[PDB]
Symmetry: D2
Subunit: 302 residues, 4 copies
Amino acid sequence: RQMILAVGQQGPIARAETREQVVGRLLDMLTNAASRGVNFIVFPELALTTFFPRWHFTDEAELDSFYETEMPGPVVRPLFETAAELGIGFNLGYAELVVEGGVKRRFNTSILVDKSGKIVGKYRKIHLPGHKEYEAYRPFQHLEKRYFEPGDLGFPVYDVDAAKMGMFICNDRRWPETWRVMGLKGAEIICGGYNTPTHNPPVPQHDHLTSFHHLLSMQCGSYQNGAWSAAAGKVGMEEGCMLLGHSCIVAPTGEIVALTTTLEDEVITAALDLDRCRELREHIFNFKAHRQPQHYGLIAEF
Amino acid sequence: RQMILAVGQQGPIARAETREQVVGRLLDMLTNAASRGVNFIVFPELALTTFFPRWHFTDEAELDSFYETEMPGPVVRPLFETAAELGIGFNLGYAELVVEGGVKRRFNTSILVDKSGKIVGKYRKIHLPGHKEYEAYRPFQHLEKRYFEPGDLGFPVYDVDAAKMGMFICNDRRWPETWRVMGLKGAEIICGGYNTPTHNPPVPQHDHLTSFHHLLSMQCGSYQNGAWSAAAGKVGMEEGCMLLGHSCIVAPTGEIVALTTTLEDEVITAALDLDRCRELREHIFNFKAHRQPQHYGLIAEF
Amino acid sequence: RQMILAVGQQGPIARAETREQVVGRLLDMLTNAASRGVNFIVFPELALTTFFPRWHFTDEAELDSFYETEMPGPVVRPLFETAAELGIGFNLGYAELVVEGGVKRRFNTSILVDKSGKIVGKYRKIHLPGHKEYEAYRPFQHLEKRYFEPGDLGFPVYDVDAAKMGMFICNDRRWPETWRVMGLKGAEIICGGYNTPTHNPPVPQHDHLTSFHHLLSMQCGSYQNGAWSAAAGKVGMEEGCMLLGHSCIVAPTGEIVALTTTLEDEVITAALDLDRCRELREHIFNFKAHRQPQHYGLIAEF
Amino acid sequence: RQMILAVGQQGPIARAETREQVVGRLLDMLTNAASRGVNFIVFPELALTTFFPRWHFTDEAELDSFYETEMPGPVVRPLFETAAELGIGFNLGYAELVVEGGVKRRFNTSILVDKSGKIVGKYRKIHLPGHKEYEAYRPFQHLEKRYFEPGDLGFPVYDVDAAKMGMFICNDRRWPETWRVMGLKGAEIICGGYNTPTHNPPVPQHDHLTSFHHLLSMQCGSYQNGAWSAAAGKVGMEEGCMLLGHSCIVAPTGEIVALTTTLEDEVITAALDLDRCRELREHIFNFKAHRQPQHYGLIAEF
């Protein structure tokens, strides 16, 4: 029922920084995480590449190169081997390219891997931010809607060694529905990563609120679900675009219990008692006792 | 499209204080509010009496005394009459007693009254906190589940003058489903009152978070729905039990734009621009563009 | 003893926008303020001009253009006459140019003006931020140390109508000594203006903390000195440079009781009760009861 | 130049809980500290006894029994022997009773002990809070002014192994002077313990701000002096009186990087980069460049 959770935040990944060098950076953080007594570490969204959705692509071949066609391929294998051997679980984000009857599926993906290097769970980003086509005024694009399909896995919850775990990815954290669905499935930890620009071209008047909106979302989702939570950012000045810092671990009371202060590769850690969830989920948010889902119908309509 | 919104926070109402004295207080706060350009004022939950669910009542007639059999009755009409002349809408919370087909129904109720003094909409509290039967292990009782039944109106949104307004009452504010159902209905202002103790007998390790959990809920509900909101507290030491302060008005971005600092009758105000909702709702929280309700079904399951 | 205090936040002022146009804008915030029972409004730092210290000037007559040689000039007189007519006092900041004994003195200056329209006190910025000589690596300049010399009035406290008021300007808010000197002189309201960019060239890895540090400074300054405060920013996108919003009024307990949400000309208001300072000044922060200045010597050394 | 800094927070100590049992509790927090890779751990104010200043003492020998006459005595010595053997530094708070020609000195005291178990610095509480004589109306008393005299060591800074460290004790943290004196002497880490009741009888309309006021003080002190900080509380329900939790570690930017979530014994850690202080102290708070101490004299007057 007890454990140490870490977040391995990443500083920038340049456009042509290779996966071998990124896996190296990931591996260093996994060591820094045995040295602090970590049991499970959370890595960012799209952790193996620069954030390619910021560019408009004209070349299919060039776009596909940012996707994984297998998990792990030879290059990413040392991440898995080392984390098994070290007895550490992890959550990894990556672009998943799947071919089905010669049709191409693109997903923004994250997996849960347990202490033994088994992949025990997958989630595909359901809430895709940004816009569908090139906008010339923007210093950088946000073309997630073109480069990915909305996930088709739902918001599942998985048994990871001794913890029930739920994944969200980036923008997902800002939608109560993300949290609630996994909240109703008993998630004790809800975790994921993000790439969050500190500038928003169409709504620049909220830039100075970037950290606020991010932390607010994590804290409230945690609280209203009695769930531990972790957000692992990829951050700093990446290919000219400032990405938000402030990766966090948050308690089931919505109290942030660990926070990053650098814009670089950074490990943070926090102690989690899976039973703390009880302080909320057997009392003020005792769902079975207090919820009235018959009046919530409008949420599920489409 | 622009208005000044106000919260009329109340200090304690003692057992033996009369509805006429309370209405007196309510009238002054209204007076101060027209003072400061106010178009609409939010009053607390059960604004007409002490917080009676604190005690266990064996005498049915005396329990009945805390309820309204009509709205407004004789004592309350002057609060109405004034605001109709001062052209000032309000939200009033009160305990409601209604007999239908042989049943004596008890509701924790609030109503929206408009500029032209016309009651435009009612809401009856859906999420009742506390417990059903007397609990000796508690220093003071919380018998809302005993003295009220869950509201039968769902979560309506009403046109009040130029603004689409939704109501919550107290514990409702802590449930994302409250906010979401009304956000889906295009509420531009979500408002209500509360009686929130700063001691919670079952989970006293959360006592020092009372402000935090209250404000977190308001700020986040507002942001994730692009709604203005207002929370009107009844506060201070009432019959030996301390009630939480910090009534507030909040912007669609989740920023508190108005907060009270006294534990007494206190009016706070803020300018609202109904179009600011668009900064969230046409962009990051464009429900049509981004929501994926085929994955939310579990929230509506019962 | 009780008043309605206000902050009048400014949107951008263009290099090509005349002082007259700016005065007209200021005059609208005055009208808005009267509308809402305001007795005193705080306007931003260097309220009459674009924030010129961002450029390097070689021609002197043009640098001088941005300064006032008297207060009021014919152009500014209308603001004095209107406020006087409305019975509303104010804190106005401007660039002051005074020639004395063969020296052209340049100050960043603010004034307090009472209900009757009397200039009751002047302050000149003591903690100038930025740099003295042009710097290459800078996406914009911040040359306050070149265009202004550190103010020569100390940190005075003045009676304005019934209130003991002290001024700070911009960067002054971040030095506890600014607050503590005025705290020790019994200031009840500490108020002032600001131009705070959301990007800082030396340390850009704190840009996502811009609002945090602004808010932290105000709240804590108020809490620890038992002072009401208000900080009026000139905000938004001005000549390529993004300036921080979040103009605030703050209670002596450090609670933010009013906050702007736009990046444009905006008026916020709050009731102040000068006797609330007592809650801190007569108790936890009873200076005479608690301070031990024998140990504070290092703070005074130079 | 890098280290791990911990906070060993304490749950309640019973009036008749023996120092042998407290020392045991302390010893176990080292364990947790070594497992998370810790170099220095900070323990609470008066960490060896219950908080006796809440009772009105009339027998002097009973009072004396809460003070230490040596440091360490046999019973406390196991605390020193271990962290020396184990190589951790600690900050321990206690009641110091000293006899000077038959005159009794009474101090509220903390010591820094380095990696090798050597006492390398002392601080005595300078800002004694509370009241000096019995008050009948109070649930619990606060007679620090009677059981201690203000400290006679000022606010020193000490080299502890690789780090320059300053001490504060409890209420000290709410005074900017405390912070500024040690910041001017180049403190990299400013640390101490506290016992902070969530109820204050003379001003109970601030009880709900207890966490706010505490956290706010630590954040702003750290920010404005460019220092890492740590506040280790003794917390929870001690002899009928509820003490505030939220022990913390703060970065030189004011950001909280660790936070306790239980009201029981609890270790938190955070990675400390001693050169990060330069982010503030070589820039915005470049003292030697920006401060204007000839205008701060009033602060040091007495």
